[PDB]
């Protein structure tokens, strides 16, 4: 049983920040764009000492993602150069974990394959903080520190709930989340202690 729903993005900048080498899905190799959230995945929010994962043992299959590779790959990147853990030992790309280990949980609010990316991609978009910060003057940078406060009223004033900010201990903001309930609209996370009152968005290393 859950209430709602958490969509969990990543800051480039942080997820790249520990170098590495150039590996097939890296969000860390593209040429030249600018540093940004991207997503990590979306799943049901359980607060109740028990926290389900890997719901139906049901293969993930490649071929039902066709509609929505150019998206994910620009907004769905792998952060690791190594395939992910995922249910039953088995080896999977981030987009295969996410789903066999949280969305096979949504059901029956989302069923299958498609219905999951395709929503975790509305939501996505649809509530776009990337376009939320760039609005209010908020971007990567590494020379710059910018008050927490502001980065929370220019989702909360863009999205209209709030989210929840996820900082390292050097004050690097590495996770972004935003809640919503079962009609996927927005929903203030539970407040959490984790960044400090300057924090930093830094651009991925070249």
Same mark, same amino acid.
């Given at each position: 049983?859950?209430?709602?729903?958490?969509?969990?993005?990543?800051?480039?900048?942080?997820?790249?920040?520990?170098?590495?080498?150039?590996?097939?899905?890296?969000?860390?190799?593209?040429?030249?764009?600018?540093?940004?959230?991207?997503?990590?995945?979306?799943?049901?929010?359980?607060?109740?000492?028990?926290?389900?994962?890997?719901?139906?043992?049901?293969?993930? /299959?490649?071929?039902? =993602?066709?509609?929505?590779?150019?998206?994910? $790959?620009?907004?769905? !990147?792998?952060? &690791? +150069?190594?395939? #992910?853990?995922?249910?039953?030992?088995?080896?999977?790309?981030?987009?295969?974990?996410?789903?066999?280990?949280?969305?096979?949980?949504?059901?029956?609010?989302?069923?299958?394959?498609?219905?999951?990316?395709?929503?975790?991609?509305?939501?996505?978009?649809?509530?776009?903080?990337?376009?939320?910060?760039?609005?209010?003057?908020?971007?990567?940078?590494?020379?710059?520190?910018? /008050?927490?406060?502001? =980065?929370?009223?220019?989702?909360?004033?863009? $999205?209209?709930?709030? !989210?929840?900010? &996820? +900082?390292?201990? #050097?004050?690097?903001?590495?996770?972004?989340?935003?809640?919503?309930?079962?009609?996927?609209?927005?929903?203030?996370?539970?407040?959490?202690?984790?960044?400090?009152?300057?924090?930093?968005?830094?651009?991925?290393?070249?």
């Amino acid at each position: 049983e859950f209430d709602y729903f958490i969509l969990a993005l990543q800051w480039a900048g942080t997820s790249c920040r520990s170098g590495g080498a150039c590996c097939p899905y890296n969000g860390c190799c593209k040429a030249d764009s600018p540093t940004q959230f991207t997503i990590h995945g979306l799943r049901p929010e359980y607060s109740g000492g028990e926290r389900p994962s890997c719901c139906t043992g049901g293969s993930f /299959d490649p071929d039902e =993602i066709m509609p929505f590779f150019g998206k994910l $790959v620009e907004y769905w !990147p792998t952060y &690791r +150069c190594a395939l #992910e853990q995922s249910c039953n030992n088995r080896k999977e790309i981030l987009w295969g974990q996410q789903y066999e280990k949280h969305g096979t949980c949504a059901s029956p609010v989302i069923k299958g394959e498609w219905n999951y990316f395709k929503k975790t991609l509305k939501l996505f978009m649809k509530y776009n903080v990337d376009k939320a910060l760039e609005d209010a003057g908020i971007v990567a940078s590494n020379s710059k520190m910018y /008050d927490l406060k502001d =980065i929370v009223v220019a989702v909360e004033s863009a $999205v209209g709930a709030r !989210p929840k900010l &996820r +900082c390292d201990e #050097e004050g690097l903001v590495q996770k972004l989340s935003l809640c919503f309930d079962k009609d996927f609209k927005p929903r203030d996370c539970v407040q959490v202690g984790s960044c400090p009152r300057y924090v930093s968005l830094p651009e991925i290393p070249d």
